[PDB]
Amino acid sequence: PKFKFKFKFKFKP
Amino acid sequence: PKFKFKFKFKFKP
Amino acid sequence: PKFKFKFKFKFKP
Amino acid sequence: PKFKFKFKFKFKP
Amino acid sequence: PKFKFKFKFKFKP
Amino acid sequence: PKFKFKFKFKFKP
Amino acid sequence: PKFKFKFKFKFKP
Amino acid sequence: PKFKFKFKFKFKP
Numbered sequence A, B, C, D, E, F, G, H: 001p002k003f004k005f006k007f008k009f010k011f012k013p
């Protein structure tokens, strides 16, 4: 089949 | 000093 | 089982 | 002064 | 194929 | 305010 | 406030 | 023909 994974990381000091 | 990361993965059968 | 991967990194000081 | 790096890799088994 | 993603976030005060 | 982030993405066929 | 980001991508045929 | 991509980002104040 088709699998899509998106990972987003946002960093604030 | 904000950091933004985007990761995209696509699976094709 | 074809694989496509995209990585985006953004850093702002 | 912001730095952005993007790398995309596609491969087939 | 089965693709597995692990995300770890650590923040120090 | 140190931040450590680890992300791992793996594919098993 | 030092920041460490780790991204890992693994592809197996 | 396995492909591995690692991205590391380090920010220092």
Ligand SMILES: O=C(Cc1cccs1)N[C@H](C(=O)O)[C@@H]1NC(C(=O)O)=C(/C=C/c2ccc([N+](=O)[O-])cc2[N+](=O)[O-])CS1
Pocket (backbone or CB within 6 Å): F002, G004
């Ligand atoms: O976290 C780990 C240990 C693991 C256990 C299980 C899975 S991975 N992975 C990395 C590795 O082993 O490869 C570590 N990565 C860093 C970093 O943190 O950049 C290192 C620098 C050492 C350092 C640290 C902390 C500080 N600090 O907080 O000041 C300063 C340094 N340094 O640069 O000397 C090298 S060792």
Ligand SMILES: O=C(Cc1cccs1)N[C@H](C(=O)O)[C@@H]1NC(C(=O)O)=C(/C=C\c2ccc([N+](=O)[O-])cc2[N+](=O)[O-])CS1
Pocket (backbone or CB within 6 Å): G012, G013, H001, H002, H003
């Ligand atoms: O740890 C290592 C060495 C490395 C150090 C750093 C990056 S690799 N061993 C590899 C690994 O596990 O990753 C070899 N790979 C595999 C497997 O998949 O378990 C094996 C089976 C068959 C195969 C499938 C795919 C490929 N491929 O994609 O190239 C190659 C082999 N092979 O015959 O070695 C035997 S071991």
